[PDB]
Amino acid sequence: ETLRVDPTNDRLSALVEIYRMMRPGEPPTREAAESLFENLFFSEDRYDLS
Amino acid sequence: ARFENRGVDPMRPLLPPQSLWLRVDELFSELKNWPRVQLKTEHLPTKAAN
């Protein structure tokens, strides 16, 4: 049912939606979205479980 | 590259560039429809129309 309620089928619009919910406005690109999502949870710099 | 760079963002989606532009092969086809001159900065050896 989460797949049904999701308005997203492909990954780029998913990263767009992530970009918009993190920061509204400022019309996104691909690379800003991929950069933001990759540094959000997968960067050793800005995210670190001890 | 710009098109899929902004092939995101359901706020202002875009048409595929095939309508707003020719393709390169489409150009080089229509460039066989007109008598054409090519000026270039070196020495071609020898042939007719040259």
From TrEMBL, chain B:
Localization per record: Cytoplasm
Protein name in the entry: Transcription-repair-coupling factor
Residues of the full protein shown: 301 to 350 of 1148
Domain of life assignment: Bacteria
Organism taxonomic ancestry: Bacteria, Pseudomonadati, Pseudomonadota, Gammaproteobacteria, Enterobacterales
Function: Couples transcription and DNA repair by recognizing RNA polymerase (RNAP) stalled at DNA lesions. Mediates ATP-dependent release of RNAP and its truncated transcript from the DNA, and recruitment of nucleotide excision repair machinery to the damaged site.
Gene name as annotated: mfd
Protein family according to the UniProt entry: In the C-terminal section; belongs to the helicase family. RecG subfamily. In the N-terminal section; belongs to the UvrB family.
